[PDB]
Amino acid sequence: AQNPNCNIMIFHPTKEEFNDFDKYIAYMESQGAHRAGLAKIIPPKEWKARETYDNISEILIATPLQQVASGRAGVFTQYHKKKKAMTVGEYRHLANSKKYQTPPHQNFEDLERKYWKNRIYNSPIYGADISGSLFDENTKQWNLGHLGTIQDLLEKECGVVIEGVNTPYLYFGMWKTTFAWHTEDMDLYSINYLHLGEPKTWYVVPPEHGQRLERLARELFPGSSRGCGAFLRHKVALISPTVLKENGIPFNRITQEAGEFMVTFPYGYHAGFNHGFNCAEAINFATPRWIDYGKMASQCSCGEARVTFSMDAFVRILQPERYDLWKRGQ
Numbered sequence: 001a002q003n004p005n006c007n008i009m010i011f012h013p014t015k016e017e018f019n020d021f022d023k024y025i026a027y028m029e030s031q032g033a034h035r036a037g038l039a040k041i042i043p044p045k046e047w048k049a050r051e052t053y054d055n056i057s058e059i060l061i062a063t064p065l066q067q068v069a070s071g072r073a074g075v076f077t078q079y080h081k082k083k084k085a086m087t088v089g090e091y092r093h094l095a096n097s098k099k100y101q102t103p104p105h106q107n108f109e110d111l112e113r114k115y116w117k118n119r120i121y122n123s124p125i126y127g128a129d130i131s132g133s134l135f136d137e138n139t140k141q142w143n144l145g146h147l148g149t150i151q152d153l154l155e156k157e158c159g160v161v162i163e164g165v166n167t168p169y170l171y172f173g174m175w176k177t178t179f180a181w182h183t184e185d186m187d188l189y190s191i192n193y194l195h196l197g198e199p200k201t202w203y204v205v206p207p208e209h210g211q212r213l214e215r216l217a218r219e220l221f222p223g224s225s226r227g228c229g230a231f232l233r234h235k236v237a238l239i240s241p242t243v244l245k246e247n248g249i250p251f252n253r254i255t256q257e258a259g260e261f262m263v264t265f266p267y268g269y270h271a272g273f274n275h276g277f278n279c280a281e282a283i284n285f286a287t288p289r290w291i292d293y294g295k296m297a298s299q300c301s302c303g304e305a306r307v308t309f310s311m312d313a314f315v316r317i318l319q320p321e322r323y324d325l326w327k328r329g330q
């Protein structure tokens with residue numbers, strides 16, 4: 001069995017290897033990459049997402065989100081307070097202001113320390129979940145707006161045509177901007193490209209141990225857990241690496257830098273934070289291997305984790321017994 005310790009693996013595809021997306025995902029899994037829940041892909045030196053990022057300042061962040069924390073330094077939840085609209089230009093200036101800027105630090109390790117020590121005492125503002133793409137239409141390899149659709153993957157595997165579209169999202173980040181512990185909708189894969197700016201630090205639990213994370217979460221957020229059997233789908237719970245280590249939870253960490261892709265694999269729980277002003281682009285995708293995961297994915301039916309009309313079909317075809325209840329929650 002490849003990668004039995006579930007280490008995060010880093011790949012350096014050649015330009016020829018970067019042509020066929022599906023084939024390279026499959027190659028990665030042949031080397032056991034999926035066991036980690038997350039892989040880093042460094043593009044060939046010949047490749048670029050687009051020519052420059054000089055002209056992105058007029059992009060609108062219609063609903064910037066202030067991430068307000070509650071709890072203790074290593075075990076907290078965050079809620080999203082909507083803020084007034086701003087452009088990327090305005091957001092970048094805000095991120096660089098004294099109130100929000102990255103503090104002086106020696107290295108990524110020092111900064112991670114500072115993050116977990118102090119995150120809860122601030123409320124950074126995240127330009128999250130903006131429909132759009134920064135890939136040039138002429139970029140033919142690993143263009144997140146031109147991947148096979150999940151709806152076509154389902155159709156090809158299972159024979160049924162369904163409604164729905166899958167498009168990418170942009171994330172404009174600043175220091176302490178946080179993504180909570182989660183797997184993707186329907187335990188899909190995701191791909192994340194860091195277009196510009198400061199790093200993004202990731203934590204990931206191997207898919208084979210996801211239930212260990214879930215158990216700890218029910219213990220650490222007892223009220224949330226009573227409220228919903230799949231509350232991690234709300235995407236509000238943070239648990240620090242120190243707490244995971246204290247509780248014997250298997251996990252790994254890595255820092256993503258501008259120009260690098262991260263792929264998360266089905267049922268790979270992940271969380272993390274931004275080091276400073278940055279922009280990432282992300283989308284979900286599927287492969288034939290995902291279908292079994294999709295069939296078994298736990299659903300939030302409590303009303304909190306409202307999602308896109310896109311998931312309807314996935315639940316309806318893959319999880320017919322759960323569909324009615326899940327629908328009531330939507």
Ligand SMILES: O=c1nc[nH]c2c(CNCc3ccccc3)nccc12
Pocket residue numbers: 128169171178179184190192200270280282283284
């Ligand atoms: O860095 C991040 N900032 C916000 N959400 C993140 C998430 C949430 N899931 C990924 C996703 C986003 C959009 C569409 C489909 C899937 N995963 C990984 C990193 C981040």
Ligand code: NI
Pocket residue numbers: 182183184190264270
């Ligand atoms: Ni994600």
Ligand SMILES: [Zn+2]
Pocket residue numbers: 227228229230231233234300301302303304305
């Ligand atoms: Zn719920």
